[PDB]
Structure formats: C-alpha cells, structure tokens
Amino acid sequence: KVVRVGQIVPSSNITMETEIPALLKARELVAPERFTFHSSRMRMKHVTKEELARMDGDSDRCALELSDARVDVMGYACLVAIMSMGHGYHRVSAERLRNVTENNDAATPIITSAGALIDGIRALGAKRVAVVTPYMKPLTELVVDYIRHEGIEVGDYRALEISDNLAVAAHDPMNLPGIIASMRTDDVDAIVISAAVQMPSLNAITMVEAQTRKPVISAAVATTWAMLTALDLPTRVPGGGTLLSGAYLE
Amino acid sequence: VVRVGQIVPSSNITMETEIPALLKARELVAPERFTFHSSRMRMKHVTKEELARMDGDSDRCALELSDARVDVMGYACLVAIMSMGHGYHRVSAERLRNVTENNDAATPIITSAGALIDGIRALGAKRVAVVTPYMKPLTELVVDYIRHEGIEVGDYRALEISDNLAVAAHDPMNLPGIIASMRTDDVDAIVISAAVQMPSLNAITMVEAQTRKPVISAAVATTWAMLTALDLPTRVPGGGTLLSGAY
Amino acid sequence: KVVRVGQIVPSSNITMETEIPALLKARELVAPERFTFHSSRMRMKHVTKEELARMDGDSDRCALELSDARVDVMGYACLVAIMSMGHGYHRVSAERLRNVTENNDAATPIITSAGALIDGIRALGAKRVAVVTPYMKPLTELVVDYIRHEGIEVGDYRALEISDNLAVAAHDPMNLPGIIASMRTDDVDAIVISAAVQMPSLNAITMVEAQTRKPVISAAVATTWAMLTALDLPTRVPGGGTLLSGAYLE
Amino acid sequence: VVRVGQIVPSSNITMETEIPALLKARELVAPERFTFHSSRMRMKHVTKEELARMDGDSDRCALELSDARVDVMGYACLVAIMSMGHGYHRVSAERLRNVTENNDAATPIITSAGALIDGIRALGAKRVAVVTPYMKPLTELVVDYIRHEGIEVGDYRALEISDNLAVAAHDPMNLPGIIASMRTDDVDAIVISAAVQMPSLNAITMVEAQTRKPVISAAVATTWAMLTALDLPTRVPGGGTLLSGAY
C-alpha cells in the first residue's frame, strides 16, 4: 500500500523534504504503508513579510501542480507564511487549496504547517507552550500572537533572527538543547522546538524530551501527524517525539 | 548528504518513485545519503503542443531548485526534449545550467533524454530495441532522435497512452511479455522504458534473464548520469547492467 | 563500518532477535554504522529455576561459539537466568564469559541483560522503579530482590505468571499500557515495561512514556544501550525510549 | 512475520549477512517481513575431520531452533554436506526435519548443498563453472558431488583457504577477475561462490554483465530454496537471475 505525499515548499527550503521523509521512513519500520514524495515550489530566499506575501500568491499554482499527480495528502510547508497573512488564515488557505484541487478533479486533504501545529498542540491537550523560531523578531511576534489568538498561551519564546533561509538550514540542531535549557519550561505544557520548517530539529527532539520531561513538537512533526491523521492512519513514528508516540489520534 | 533536484511534469510520479528507490538501494552499498527536492511544470496530456509549453517552464524549475543549492538536477521528461528538435538535450542542459549559475548556484543538469543516449553509449551498444508509452507520432520522433545520435533502432513498440498520469498506472509486469513479442536477437541492449513516467524497475532483472541482453530505462539512465555527474560510483543493486558497478 | 553483534539467547526466545535488530535498524537511519546479527542458543522451553540453571550451564559453550566469529560485542539475553543464580552473579557471568572469549583468542566486551538493566537504571539516575515481568511469582520476587540488592528501590511490580516461554512471546504488547496504568507510577523514577527479554514491549514503549511521563526501559532496550556504550558509540535510537534518547552515554 | 532459522558453523558470518541482506531487499517488493534466528555448531578449520564432527552437531541445532517454532531452517555449510558422501543433502534434510517433528515443530529444512543443486536445475543449466574457497581435495569432492547429481562442471577454481573466518574476509571484488580468467563460454551458469561463507552478493550483477550468463551463489540458492519452501514469490532485487522473479 503506497501513499503519495505532496509538499508545497518554499524554493529555498530543504528541511521539509528531509524531515518528513525521515519520519515516514521510520514509520515504515513499524507499519505496512509505503510513502512516495512529490513537491511543488513557491519562490522565497529570505524570510521577510514581502517575500512571504509574494510566495503565498503562488499557492494555487502549487496545489494545481500537485493535484495533477493525484497526491493523497498535500502539506503547505511554511508556518510563518500562513500566520503572516492574519488571524484565521490557516483555515482560509486550507479551504482555498482544497477547492483548487477539487476543481482540478482530484479533491485532496490539505494540511498547513500552521494549522497542524495548532491542532497538534490541542491534541496534546497542551494549554501553554514555549516556542523557538529562527525568524526576525517582528515575524516571531506575529506567530506568538497567532498562537495566542488560537487560545494557546505562550510563555518563553526565542527568535534566532536569521532571515537568509539557506542560513536557517545551516543552523546546528545540536545548539537547540542549550537554547531550550536557557528558557523557562517548567510552567509550560509542551515545547515547540521549531515553529519553522526550514530549521532542522528532528535530531534533537528525543534529547530535549529527555532533558525537559515535556512533550516536544516541531512544525515538521505536527505536519506529519496531521497528514497521517487526515489519511486515517496510526500516528506512531519512531523518533518523532510525544505527538508521534502512537498515543494521539485526534 | 547529497541533494538531488528533480524537474518533473506535474503529472509525473514515477521519477520521484524510481530515482529515490534506486538511490535508497545505493545507500546500502555506499556511504552517501540522499535527499530529494522537486519542482513541477504543468502538463496532463502528452502532445507536441503541451510538451513545448511545459518545456518553456523548465527555466523556472531550475531557478526554484537552485534556490535550495541542490547538488544535481534531473529533467524527467524524455519526449519533451526529443520533441523540441535534434540535439536539444545539449541545448536544454546548457540553458538550464546557465539559469542556476545566474542564480549564484551553478549545478550539473541531467536530462533523461541525454542520460539515455549517454547510458546506451556507456554500454557500448550500437543497436537498441525500445518500448515507449507515447502516441505513435511522438515515438517516431523519439526513434528518429536516437538514430540521429548514431544509435540504431530495431524493434520498437508504442503503448499510445497520452494521459500522462495513466502512463504511470501501466503494469510493469506487462513489460516482459511486450519484450518477448519483439525481436531482440539483432540488438545489443533493450530500452525497457524510454519514459521515466512508465515504471519498469521491478521488471529489469526479469527481462535481462529472459533476453540475456543489458536492459536500461530512462529512469536508471538518469540515476546513472546524475551519479556520474557527482563523480560517484554507480553500483546500485537491482538497477540492471548500467548500474552493475561495471558502468 | 560494520558491527558484528553476538547474542546468547534461550533456544525458545524469539523476541531478543526481533527487538535488538529492530532498534539497531532504526539507529541506521540516524547514524552511519551498519549491524550484522549472530546468535548462539542455550536450550530452555519453560522459565523455571531448574531450566534456568541448566541453561546457564551452556553459557561457556555459547561464548565459544560466538567468539569463533569474532563478534564485536556479545549479549547474554536472559535477565532472570542471571539473577536466579544469586546476588552479584551478573558480574561473575560477564567476567567468566569475557575470559572464555579471551582464551578463544577474541576478547569481546560482554553484556548481560541483567547488568545492562541495572546500569541503564543508574544511567537514568533513577532511584526507584516500577517493574513488569512475565514470570511466575517466585522468580519475579528474586528479580525484585536482586534489583533492591543493587541499591535500586522497587515500588509497584506485576508478574504475568506465564512460564511457557513461547506463550510469553505470544503476549500482546498492547496489553502493557493498561497493566502499567493499573500500577502506581507517580512515586517512581522509571518504568521497566519488561524485565524479560521474551515478552515483546518495544512497540508500546513510546505510548507508555506519553501516558505516564516517566522514562520507560526494557531488558532489550537496556541491553542495546549497553552494547552501544561498550562500543563507544552514540546511543540515540529512534523509538527506543528515554534511555536511547541520545542523552545518555554512561 | 516470517521466522528464518539458520544452522551455521560457529565461525560462519556470511550466511547471517547475505541472507538478511537479500530478505531485507525483498521486503521492499513484497509484504512479508523477516526475523532471523541462529544456532551454531563449532568449527574453525575446514578439514574433512572437523566438517564431519561439526555435522554431528547438526541435530542439536535443529532441536534448538525448533524450540522457537521457526518457519524454515537453512543449513549453511555446503562442503560439510558434500563431504559426507553422495546424495547426503537429502539424508541430512530428512534427519533434521525428523528432529524438529519429534520436538513438536516440524519445519522445512534447506541445506545450502541441496539448494545449489536445485537452483542450478531451476535455471535449466546443464553445465556449470564453479568458484570455491576450499582446499583442493575438498573442492574435488564438491565438483564430484555436483557431477554425480547430473550437472556437468567445466572450469573450477579453489582459493585454498582452510581458515573459515578468513574465507569471509576474501574480497568479493576479486571474484569478477577470477571469473574473467576462467573459461565460461562452454557453460550455462556460473557458481560465483559454492560457499555461503565466501561473500559474493555485491559481485553478482557485475559478473552477469561481464559474462552474459546467469550467476548464482550458495547464499542466493539457499534464500531461493527457503522462499520456495514457504511458497513465497522469489523476486529479490540485486540477487541475480535465480531471484529474478522468473525463477
């Protein structure tokens, strides 16, 4: 049984195409489904409001491109691009993209990273969250405010202020445990190790869970959780942290 | 980690299937690991006009993929290249490379058309039998292109499936039977699939056993050519003669 | 880089040869080392004191068999067989087996499941532990007393009382979360989901960690941790629970 | 889940390497998953006497593995079986099966000796070239055994390595060169390794490409024969002609 996964990714993004396949490859050790990966790109090189807004404009084209392949699920990878567009935009985006696929004769469940993160946090039953991002400070503020608007408290948060998206990919994930250690996490229900999909975090997730004893999620992890759930499949993925423990089928 | 870029028709699913499968197999025999990154050019129906329009979008795709500083790029659609005119695989690869260089990330560009020709030559094969999924006029162009490159063509078959997604649904286990119904004794190598879109991977060894001749597909040729472009050994289990390790 | 793993297993044991390769297969997704697996068998069909004592007598033969292959590490799989022989026997067994390999011209690091479990608990810094076993009650008592003797408190423990070793293999690991739920685990530092190496538990480990928010280990997990550490290799294994999070190189 | 039992000489490491590798490759093309379980019979030096003593321990191994209710058993050592006398692969398999039945767990028993002969026959090969790692007198016995089974032997080579663990250290990439120095034109198939202990897996496709003849090893034969004993399809990528899917 083969599942075709479609990914709408920023052109300069390399991490979504690394971590989502890594996770699902691990899942193949544990469950019979096999996965193939199919991408469409929307141009962005620098994570600024202007580039984000322009990139999102290519959204429809990308969904047309991937529904031409009759992909079984489609994930819009960039969390901040969705949240940058204003409150509740993750719903707008998902519904519009679904319509685009439906009118291309291949209705597909649509996941956005932004929506997946919110849904994953709710599935965990987490009420308060700590958040690490790689974004410039204003963008990070928007994200935190978006999460708060969705009824999820935000405690400590950190912004690495790296706008060059290729430089974001170059950030050492082994720095992340020390960053999280220097944040308050005792008053938090879950830790968002990366709100961004470009910043690698997968290889630090289990370490951080061990160190903090809190559930750790990332935009990438939440997205795969949401894709799996949208396909009515078990969500147990080795190395994917608490959300992918197998205990959560929300 | 090696970053592989894939420029694919929107309806193409088999390049993103067989190339990862091959490279995953390679990870078992060699230390390199691969990640895969795609950009799409829209096309549902494989006609002369649509192929030309889609190729016009090639450049955007190379731009998008070089934003991610990919280590190689493979252009999936064989017939698109061969449809544009004689020798076009060279012109395309050059123009696409220039795009990546102007985007501050010059990268080697492989077309499945060029890869098949180079693969055939690497095999030392002078004469070839070919299976395609294309409509008859288009496979006439493909055969003529191959012949223009100094490679003789014996028996060839066209499945005449213009619906590109439908091409990927063709059962690879049909391919040995198709080949068995063709003359292959006057041939040095068998092109089991001239199209990356038509799956053939699981049929390659069977056909090699049945015919006792080296068998290649556009998909294994592309894999071979991308590996060679990165100066990497080309031993891949289950990839047939071209990926023997021998070359 | 290939690592030859040797396993001394009860003849009727199937789970050690399932979970240790499963774990190390997952590790191959994350680290460059590749593993091959080589077993020697010591006969046992029923987990009784008499069968355990007889089985342990074949110990030297098994170590000779595996050192003929110049295995890079050697694990004695059966936890209860070691503990059944009296306090401190895990040290005796490891040193004797090492000597056997050394005199067979292939000195090998030796791990026992029993010793690995104790070392893994200490590596976690866990002081008090809850324990599930499949053994008959007297044998379970010995194990708990062995752990206590090693300076590790035992709170709640459960014994499934299944002595047919093939029946132990047939125990549904999805029963384990409910068993652990009906034990007190708030006053415990870590949960031993299986003290036995025959009872499957790997596929329930991450679920139980999510449900309890405590580190979960098994004899199988502790053994692979100990084998990896003995080979000076990182201990990050996807799906292997807290001990294999990558945070513990004791 | 399919439970595979392996009866191996203590110093044998390659059966537990190539059989898992092959079956892992199969998991990519077929739904079955495999676990591996071994029992050992002591032996360091491959001599007539030691082979006989080690074979005397076969029964214990079958007993130990049937305690775990394994779905098949493969006896690794080809020369041990062929050394005991003509037709011994049948006697051994039968005696070992009876052991498992008396242990309330009757299981199909494959010997690498029987598997190679059955594999050669399944290929339709009448005449064969053979490479062995054994000392000359022992490979004389092996060749004579094969000839007694109705399979002609052309060119054969003996590497004369009596240290069994050392056999596994022989570079498989030496094998194409060894074969290239042998006559293979008067042969229907090539036994690239008559010993499971001598690795050959990574050389199979290369030799098939170089010689244009089906290539089998005792290790792929054993894998083929165990799969057939469980009525499972025998398509395994990278396993050469016998594991083509064709048979």
**Dist CA D172 CA C149 (whole Å):** 52
Distance of alpha carbon B21 from alpha carbon B36, whole angstroms:
11
Per the structure block, which two tokens stand in for B160?
Answer: 């005449």
Q: Choose among A72, A87, A78: nearest CA to A47.
A: A78
How many angstroms separate the most distant Cα atoms in chain B? 50
Instruction: Tell me whether residues D10 and C40 touch, CB distance under 8 A.
Output: yes
Query: Which technique was used to obtain these atomic coordinates?
Result: X-ray
State the distance between the two ends of chain A, measured CA to CA, in whole angstroms: 23
HSE at residue B179, side-chain half, CA atoms within 13 A, is 32
Helix (H) or strand (E) segment spanning residue D211: helix D204-211
Which neighbouring-strand residues pair with A39? Answer: A7
Instruction: State whether residue A20 is helix, strand or coil.
Output: helix
Assign residue B109 a region: left if phi > 0, alpha if psi is -120 to 50, beta otherwise?
Answer: beta
C174: closest CA of chain A, how far (Å): 11
Which pair of tokens denotes residue A138? Answer: 């204003």
What CA–CA distance (Å, rounded) separates C202 from D110?
A: 31
- Using the structure block, give the residue that is written with the tokens 């001598």: D198
- In this structure, are residues A4 and A20 in contact, taking their beta carbons and an 8 Å threshold? no
CB distance B29 to B235 below 8 Å:
yes
Exposed/middle/buried for residue B180 (C-beta within 10 Å: 0-12, 13-18, 19+): exposed
C121/C209 Cα distance (integer angstroms): 15
Q: Which residues of B touch D202 (CB under 8 A)?
A: 29, 235, 237, 245
- D237 interfacial to chain B (CB closer than 8 Å): yes
CA B99 to chain CA mean position, Å: 21
Residue C102 DSSP SS3: helix
Of B206, B212, B237, which is closest to D25 when you measure between CB atoms? B237
**Closest C-alpha among D68, D197, D24 to residue C17:** D68
A238 touches chain C (CB under 8 A): yes
CB contact under 8 A, C68 and D42: yes
Protein fold of A1-250: Rossmann fold (3.40.50)
Q: Which residues of D136-167 are buried (b: 16+ CB within 10 A; e: fewer)?
A: eebbebbbebbeebebebbbbbbbebeebbbb
Domain D1-247: CATH architecture, name and number where available: 3-Layer(aba) Sandwich (3.40)
**In units of Å, what resolution does this entry have?**
2.1
Token code pair at residue D33: 């998953």
Question: Is A154:A117 a contact under the CB 8 Å cutoff?
Answer: no
Token pair for residue B90?
């060279």
> Contact A69/B17, CB-based, under 8 Å?
no
Count of C-beta atoms within a 10 Å radius of residue D113: 30
Q: How many helices (H) and strands (E) does chain C have?
A: 11, 8
CB D65 within 8 Å of CB D37: yes
CA angle (D118 as vertex; D115, D122 as ends), nearest 5: 130
Within an 8 Å CB–CB cutoff, is residue B53 touching chain A? Answer: no
Helix (H, G, I), strand (E, B) or coil at C106: coil
Phi, psi for B122 (deg, rounded to 5) = -60, -35
Is any Cβ of chain B less than 8 angstroms from the Cβ of D124? no
Q: Which two tokens stand for residue C159?
A: 């014994």
Nearest residue to A18 (alpha-carbon basis) of A202, A208, A192? A202
Q: Which strands sit side by side in the sheet containing B189-193, from one edge to the other?
A: B152-158, B127-132, B189-193, B215-217
Chain B interface mutation, best of A2, A7, A14, A54, highest count of B Cβ atoms under 10 Å: A14
Q: Measuring CA to CA, how many Å separate A172 from each of A12, A157, A178, A198, D12? A: 17, 18, 11, 12, 43
Among A69, A109, A129, CA closest to A223: A109
List the one residue out of C1, C19, C37, C247 whose CA is nearest residue C124: C247
CB contact under 8 A, B37 and A45: no
Residue with tokens 């028709």: B9
- The answer to whether the CB of A212 falls within 8 A of the CB of A191 is yes
Q: Which one, of D94, D92, D100, D138, lies nearest residue D3 by Cα? A: D100
CB under 8 Å to B194, separation ≥6 — which residues? B78, B79, B116, B130, B131, B132, B134, B139, B142, B217, B218
Compute the half-sphere exposure of residue A226: CA atoms within 13 Å on the CB side of its CA.
27
Asked if C60 is an interface residue toward chain D (Cβ–Cβ < 8 A), one would say no
**Per the structure block, which two tokens stand in for A181?**
């250690």
| CA-closest candidate to residue C190, choices C156, C235, C149 | C156
Pair B32, B13: CB distance under 8 Å: no
* Amino acid (one-letter) located at B30: A
Residues of B in contact with D208 (CB under 8 A): 208, 241, 244
Residue D208: closest CA among B213, C127, C222, B217: B213
Contact present, B94 and B27 (Cβ < 8 Å): no
Return the SS3 of A148. helix
Residues paired with residue C159 on neighbouring β-strands, in sequence order: C133
Q: What is the DSSP string of B149-212?
A: TT-EEEEEEE----BHHHHHTS-GGGHHHHHHTS--TT-SEEEEES-SSS--GGGHHHHHHHH-
**Residue B40: what are its φ and ψ, rounded to 5°?**
-115, 145
Contact between A132 and A193 under an 8 Å Cβ cutoff? The reply is yes
